[PDB]
Design a protein around this ligand. Structure first.
Ligand SMILES: [Ca+2]
Lengths: 68, 68
């Protein structure tokens, strides 16, 4: 969670990996998953997300979070 | 699956990085942020989260997701 390639350190990569594992469980909780869907349905049209087309597509259509 | 270092590839690191930015804005929405901190309060005790205590602490006390 930062747009700076300078902060894109493998230590921060691991930090972010683990925090995403934590929040992923929260997103699957009933109610929350629907409000998250509503958020994405709104956010996918927000042109501030330059270059995130593919990640918005994967989250909205329920594609896996990572590539196995 | 995110626990297996076999998939800790660089493509997956970047994918997680960008998806975590998307999810971070949702967690700042009013209502959701409270529900998330409640979730964290409950879940910190579960043994699934052994060795995630630093991340739970950072998320619980409003630390930046990455160091910076
Ligand atoms: Ca809806």
């Amino acid at each position: 969670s930062m747009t700076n390639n300078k902060y894109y350190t493998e230590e921060n990569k691991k930090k972010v990996w683990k925090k995403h594992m934590i929040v992923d469980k929260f997103l699957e909780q009933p109610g929350i998953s629907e409000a998250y869907l509503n958020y994405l349905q709104e956010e996918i049209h927000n042109d501030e997300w330059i270059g995130f087309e593919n990640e918005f597509f994967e989250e909205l259509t329920g594609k896996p979070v990572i590539n196995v």
